[PDB]
Amino acid sequence: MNPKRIRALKSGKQGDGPVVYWMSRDQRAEDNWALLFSRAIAKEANVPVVVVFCLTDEFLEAGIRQYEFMLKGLQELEVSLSRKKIPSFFLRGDPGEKISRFVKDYNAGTLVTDFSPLRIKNQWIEKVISGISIPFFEVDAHNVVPCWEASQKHEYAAHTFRPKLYALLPEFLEEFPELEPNSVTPEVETLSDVLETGVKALLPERALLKNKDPLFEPWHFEPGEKAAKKVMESFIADRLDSYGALRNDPTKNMLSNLSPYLHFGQISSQRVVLEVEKAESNPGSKKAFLDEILIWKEISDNFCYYNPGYDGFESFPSWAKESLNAHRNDVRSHIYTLEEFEAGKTHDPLWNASQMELLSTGKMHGYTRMYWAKKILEWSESPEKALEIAICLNDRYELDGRDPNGYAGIAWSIGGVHDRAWGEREVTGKIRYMSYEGCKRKFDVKLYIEKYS
């Protein structure tokens, strides 16, 4: 157990009650450093461990596609945690008022949570700190190397964050120890009813077509830790060999499709890296996949951790802010509203077909994600309007939405974060441009459009 994975946010006097694991980002029982760190401290104090999840009031800011995927995975998690004699408590409302009330009611001895560099998680941490007198720690269970240990600084490029992450891999890339069950079973509603009431509250804002039928197809990704592992096994066995040569072709499903399980924390990235590193495949394809799940995934947490305004124009590089400001008054070719972007009613069939894959599957291809966001900057009134539209459409319809990957990805597409300056164009400036003809020379754009009518 590396002590560099755990951070102390506030000290205090330890109580003689159950160690509380405030689960948030990592919703799994296996390969969870935060849950394992809570069981170790609970064992050292001769007291069982408990897990608490808060169903926040911000669930209506998303959709049914993310509400059902999360709660259905939590239902499987409760059975898995109960088999280890670890009881789970699902509170509903403000985590600042619920976690404070749970710790005081149940006489908690130590509170533990998982690490998330997002602003909304820091908002909960600030409120819970104000009304708790017991120790409270946080553990990085999402990244292989802790976010505060990989770099003490915002890395402006992947060429600089790669040697720092790979030099610390022999230390943090290790096997997980078995989660020991509680010694004895210790001493606020069922998730089936919370799923029924929540869906009934999200029904009027459901994504529908003109025929009143639903648009989302929930048979593409089955939720749960069991299904998350089966997806990783299928990728290593069938798709990992052809990954390095077909990750940029949206007409072929050659990606790992592990992003919805990785966002909600249903599967550990360290577990995926461990199975891939010991797998024998194309070295060019293994290097490309490890570059995506290690470098670009953890540099997204690095961007959100060392940039408070990671979702704003101020976090852009100085060369991009100066380039975008010099082309602010440039006459845009087209100006579409948020409703026209949402329904995919633009003149570009490639962008519209990309938006249709986002609305129907909740997981648009990785290559088209760059074309989908860069066109928003080209057809918006201002770079700040492009950030708002793309963030809203990402977090609302992407199953992996509301994730540091999405915020670092959108910062690269429009703001050029972790990128370089390209040829100076109008409107877009020195931001890397992706043309429609450039996509046709890379893949069958006609098949990708015909698939998502």
Ligand SMILES: Cc1cc2nc3c(=O)[nH]c(=O)nc-3n(C[C@H](O)[C@H](O)[C@H](O)COP(=O)(O)OP(=O)(O)OC[C@H]3O[C@@H](n4cnc5c(N)ncnc54)[C@H](O)[C@@H]3O)c2cc1C
């Ligand atoms: C405009 C835009 C929006 C995005 N929105 C999201 C989002 O809402 N949520 C989200 O998790 N990711 C987002 N991404 C990153 C990336 O596109 C997706 O992670 C990817 O499409 C997920 O599909 P996959 O896991 O099957 O691909 P794979 O090739 O199997 O990648 C595996 C994993 O590596 C990581 N990874 C790979 N590429 C990236 C990347 N560019 N950035 C960060 N991590 C990466 C991911 O964790 C990914 O799950 C976005 C990127 C862009 C440019």
